[PDB]
Design a protein around this ligand. Sequence first.
Ligand SMILES: N[C@H]1CC[C@@H](N2CCCCCN3/C(=N/S(=O)(=O)c4cnc(N5CCNCC5)c(c4)C2=O)Sc2c(Cl)ccc(O)c23)CC1
Ligand SMILES: Nc1nc2c(ncn2[C@@H]2O[C@H](COP(=O)(O)OP(=O)(O)NP(=O)(O)O)[C@@H](O)[C@H]2O)c(=O)[nH]1
Ligand SMILES: [Co+2]
Ligand SMILES: [Co+2]
Ligand SMILES: [Mg+2]
Length: 161
Amino acid sequence: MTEYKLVVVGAGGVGKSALTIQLIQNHFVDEEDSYRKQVVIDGETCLLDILDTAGYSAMRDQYMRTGEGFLCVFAINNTKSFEDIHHYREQIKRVKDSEDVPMVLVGNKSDLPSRTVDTKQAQDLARSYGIPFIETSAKTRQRVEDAFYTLVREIRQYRLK
Ligand SMILES: N[C@H]1CC[C@@H](N2CCCCCN3/C(=N/S(=O)(=O)c4cnc(N5CCNCC5)c(c4)C2=O)Sc2c(Cl)ccc(O)c23)CC1
Ligand SMILES: Nc1nc2c(ncn2[C@@H]2O[C@H](COP(=O)(O)OP(=O)(O)NP(=O)(O)O)[C@@H](O)[C@H]2O)c(=O)[nH]1
Ligand SMILES: [Co+2]
Ligand SMILES: [Co+2]
Ligand SMILES: [Mg+2]
């Protein structure tokens, strides 16, 4: 049965853990580990192996080398987290020595009114990076499945390249 190593990266407090737990338990966390889940996507069965990282170059480099797909998460109310997406993507590409790595840009906290990053701005960036963009709320569970499953789909597209 096919396994996919997924890695959730992004600045402190963007909601990496809340997103991962929302997929695993369907519950929103309140006041660093790996998770497993078997899912059917497009009629193929697979095992999702997800590493929830925190916002040591050797440890970092190991997960970026091991990871097959990366959810690059920013929060729509934190411009710095959005700007730092450059940094995560650059580090991944350097480690994997490839311009093409399955990735999905996720703008989390879509339920918040204090928005500092416009959907259009993140869409344009993702288009520049050649990766899907999805806005999520870990709070409401809006597009959480969508983000992880789009990522798996990207890994499969890549594997057929
Ligand atoms: N939960 C405790 C035991 C596992 C610890 N841990 C994180 C879980 C590692 C799970 C296996 N793994 C990996 N193992 S690892 O390369 O040796 C590794 C990478 N980062 C880890 N951490 C903890 C340190 N800070 C970064 C995340 C740990 C292990 C690392 O020492 S990589 C990896 C990827 Cl890319 C996807 C899915 C994975 O399951 C995966 C966390 C403390
Ligand atoms: N309103 C709202 N709050 C969220 C959302 N996702 C996470 N949060 C909140 O954001 C804060 C940080 O969430 P957490 O999941 O721990 O983020 P993290 O990115 O995993 N943090 P770290 O880098 O330290 O590991 C918490 O208060 C959490 O409840 C969301 O979609 N909406
Ligand atoms: Co609870
Ligand atoms: Co740079
Ligand atoms: Mg966390």
